[PDB]
Amino acid sequence: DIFKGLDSLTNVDLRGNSFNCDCKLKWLVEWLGHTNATVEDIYCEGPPEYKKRKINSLSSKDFDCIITEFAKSQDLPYQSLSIDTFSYLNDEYVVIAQPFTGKCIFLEWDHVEKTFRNYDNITGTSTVVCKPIVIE
């Protein structure tokens, strides 16, 4: 998005200038969906997925860079050794074994507040594993 730093503009020239049309450069294509000024599109030679055509004709879906990160939702205070999940009754339950307690805990996802809800527990001395298997 270096282009938008300047406010007023009427002409930008692209001729004989090499490029590598990747996801990071994808913004240009997105900017090419908003551009109005007099511009001539030239060839781009980056990834081989992009052939000898014009960048303005590109679509943002040709670059398939899906940014994936992780958002923290720390709520469970209890310690754990084995965490294993299994689909059952159209609700994939998460089963957790708590050390030093002998407690096996069951969590079910609910859409009330976008979390997992504890609903059941097991008796034990010091849990190590709680391998869940559903058969019949």
Added chain:
Amino acid sequence: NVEEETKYIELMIVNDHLMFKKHRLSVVHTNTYAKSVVNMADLIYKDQLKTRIVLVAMETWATDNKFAISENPLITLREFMKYRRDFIKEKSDAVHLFSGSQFESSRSGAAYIGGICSLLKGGGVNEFGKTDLMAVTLAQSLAHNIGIISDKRKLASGECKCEDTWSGCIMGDTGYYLPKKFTQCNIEEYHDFLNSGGGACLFNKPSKLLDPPECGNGFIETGEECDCGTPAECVLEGAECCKKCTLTQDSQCSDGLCCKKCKFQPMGTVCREAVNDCDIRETCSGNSSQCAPNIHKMDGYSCDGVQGICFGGRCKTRDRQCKYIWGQKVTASDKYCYEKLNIEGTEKGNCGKDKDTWIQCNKRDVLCGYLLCTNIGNIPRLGELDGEITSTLGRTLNCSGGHVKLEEDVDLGYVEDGTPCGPQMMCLEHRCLPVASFNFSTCLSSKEGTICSGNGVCSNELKCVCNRHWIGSDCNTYFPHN
């Protein structure tokens, strides 16, 4: 007391070539590895047992194994112990084998129960494993050698259990996740063993270690005139005695019971009261900070007028045999069962262990045959039952016996060798024999048929310890002193 005193177990490690090759043939790596394992085991033992395991020496075979190596822990343990008897001579409380041959058994390491401070029993075998793994194995084996074992009867009855219920305790099968705490019955067995007189060679401080001179390591080693330890713990004990491994102006001690308030205590003080009649009280020499060397009644001395004999400082009676084998509530039966079962019978009275044709016992003496006790419980404290416990019923007595085994070929079901049958009449090879069978030595005596000129008792080192105001070596001259 003696229990509260800091025990010093002189351990020497024998290492085979399997783990030497597994350690890239490096001598120094194996040496430092053994040092680290010894330090880790000492850290284990310091929390409760108050016992420091001093690595006096260690031998690792860079060439190859001398004797036959088998996956059987018992056979390999026997081979290691006989090799120690044949070749190893240096003084060491425990001789432990790091077995490169990983035993194909379920138990981690094989160590005799209560076998420490013995030439043919003082140690065990620990198989190959991880640093922490064989450290735990060594701790378990040394607990075995000092008589500390998991109590099967209390395990079944729930009398005492592991307080580290998370991952169990060390005495059980070695789980991956090590615990940090021993049970109270471990310590109770330790007091019972030390009070019985066993483990009397653990009360000496070695002057030479495998560790270079290190200030504050708890041992007065070469190059250190005094050592009170790190000044953090030096405040409680020996604050004014030794500082920074150096004396504080006029001083004569660093630690030790024979030196109170950093100054010499009066002559004649008892730095160690006798645990029983088999033990001899120790008096400070008058110029030595550390207590007198442990001295016990010489092997053959009776715990009482006739019954019982002190072997290695440990009392042995028929009642004591029943207590060790079966339990405290179990006591030896009367002569009625001995003369009514050992004379003739299968599985009830037998001199020698022969399943096909049981060995007959004569009427002259029946006290070395089948060990017969009173009110034997469902399971013994240690060992295994060869079949079922024998039960046999004017006076009526609840008569019982068994065939308790051990990790050794010796059978605890019978009467142990040396149990008295009468005047100088004690068990040898499941038979009552005189002293001439054992060939006990005669201490320094001047009269005829006496010990230490009559008045006085000979210690375990075959040296007379004369009574009060008797300075002569053979208890012959009286020297009054104040």
